[PDB]
Amino acid sequence: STAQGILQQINTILRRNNAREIEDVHNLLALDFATENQNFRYWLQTHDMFFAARQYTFHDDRNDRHDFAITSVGPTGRDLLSSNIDNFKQKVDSGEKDRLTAIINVGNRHWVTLVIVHQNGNYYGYYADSLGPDIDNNIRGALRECDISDDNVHDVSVHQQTDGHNCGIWAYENARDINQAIDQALQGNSNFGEKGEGIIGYIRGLLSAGIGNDTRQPQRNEQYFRNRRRNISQLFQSLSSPRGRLIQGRPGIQHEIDPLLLQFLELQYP
């Protein structure tokens, strides 16, 4: 069986059940289904990233001073992220927000993190890509259309992964740590300096924790990311994934589609 063979079989079942056919089998995959079958190389999609946000306490709660957005780049390639940064800058002017955390899909299944803080009239930004130091043009173009100065946006990336499949979780690990570094800098642990650059070394200390030669716990090895995947998957228990919407719309169809999805997972992500 091939991926297209599986897709044709799924689409026959969807047709019999008066549901919309799909164009890619990934449309019906989600982190919980993959993790329940021990496919830990599954790349997290946009719908999975909403559940991961709740695991890292981002969806809300960290009404409060922090803004949060899951967006993408690549209408113009920049409109969604630009719109989020604009809405944030308005809320800063309204006195409602101090900080924005954005988790950004840069197109080819790659997730990166951008955190912007406002402190007494200035906007400082910190960008992290788990692949290591390189910033993406659409990100830079979104920042330029929102008048965030390039001098005040800093690439704090550290080499953390090469496999690619865990960049979705690394994006949240890095957002947590950038936000902790900013929090501690506000309390005097470090100084921002004129352009916000002063905290970059402290950020990189947290981003490098538990990888390579660093012995700090948790060691963020493959087993660590398997357990994070298991923990994120527990939050799925429905309507927020395309799979969950199909199941709720056609209860019991999972008995016909899940065997084929498992075959696809074995092929795409062995």
Numbering used by the authors: 837 to 898, 903 to 914, 922 to 981, 984 to 1086, 1089 to 1121
Quoted passage from the original study:
Cytoplasmic incompatibility (CI) results when Wolbachia bacteria-infected male insects mate with uninfected females, leading to embryonic lethality. CI is caused by linked pairs of Wolbachia genes called CI factors (CifA and CifB). Protein-binding experiments and expression of cif genes in yeast have shown that CifA binds its cognate CifB specifically and rescues CifB-induced yeast growth defects.
We determined the crystal structure of the CidBwMel DUB domain to 1.85 Å resolution. Similar to the structures of other proteases in the CE clan/Ulp1-like protease family, the DUB core consists of a five-stranded β sheet flanked by α helices on both sides. His957, Asp976, and Cys1016 form the catalytic triad. An active DUB domain is required for inducing a CI-like phenotype in transgenic D. melanogaster for cid operons.
